[PDB]
Design a protein around this ligand. Sequence first.
Ligand SMILES: O=C(CCCl)NNC1=[NH+]CCN1
Length: 330
Amino acid sequence: STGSATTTPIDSLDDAYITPVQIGTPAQTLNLDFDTGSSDLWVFSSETTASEVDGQTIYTPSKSTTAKLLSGATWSISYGDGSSSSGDVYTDTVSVGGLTVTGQAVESAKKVSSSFTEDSTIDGLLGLAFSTLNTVSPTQQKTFFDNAKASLDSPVFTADLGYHAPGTYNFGFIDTTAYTGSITYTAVSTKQGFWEWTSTGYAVGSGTFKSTSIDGIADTGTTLLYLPATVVSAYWAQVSGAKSSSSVGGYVFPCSATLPSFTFGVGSARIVIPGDYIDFGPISTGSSSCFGGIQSSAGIGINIFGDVALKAAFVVFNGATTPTLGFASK
Ligand SMILES: O=C(CCCl)NNC1=[NH+]CCN1
């Protein structure tokens, strides 16, 4: 089997991407944030504290003839941006783009942090890291991809995120029309539960490529690109007027700037992030200072190849017995 679904930016800055997911019988369609940096599928629901719902579509398990409470199971999660949610758990039928998993753990939120409430476009998250990160207790649950893997034509999914435009998530096949050149595959460590790999280096604009190993994770659920302070300093040094702002919480730059591209190494191959991808717009409405799309990972604890990086590429999340990651230009 295979599945294919369109993923759409939630706003003009590509702050996140939502993908329609069918849950339950008859189908309840929620727009979920596909997140390769976590492993819980959780939804706003009829159980979410009423004051914490503001425009989201909710999952009502009592209206699904296939929903079953998973007795005693609870979940609680915090993400790299400080947001969090928690609740109880049902199993139900979940379909993405024609691909169906019966008995998927659907984690029903009782509480969400303010960041989720304030984002009316995201109805929940669909985690696609490794199931060892799943937060359900006392019985850990499998991701959608994990549950679907055996049935898929090939044990893979691909992320093809658009820059200010719709994109595609495919399960079980590689669309050879969706990228240029060849796919370079690189080894993955599952030891932390993430799609963790090692970039071979970087360049800033037309500069010379620096060979240096950068361990990081491929994370569709993070907006920006978080790299070591040395790398990030080298990038923003090429931008007149750019500075790290403690008050704003990161690198900012004059909105009048044209930004240099940023290249990251995948084995012997190169992915080039266009400069425009690194512009995340005014720090506040009307401001002439703009927030940078490349930020320091210091204090985060891990380097994160977020959407800024992943949307410059066609990305293959290969869940074979020995997982690997594939990157192609597009
Ligand atoms: O939580 C992380 C970072 C793990 Cl190091 N990514 N996934 C995610 N989903 C919502 C915001 N962040």
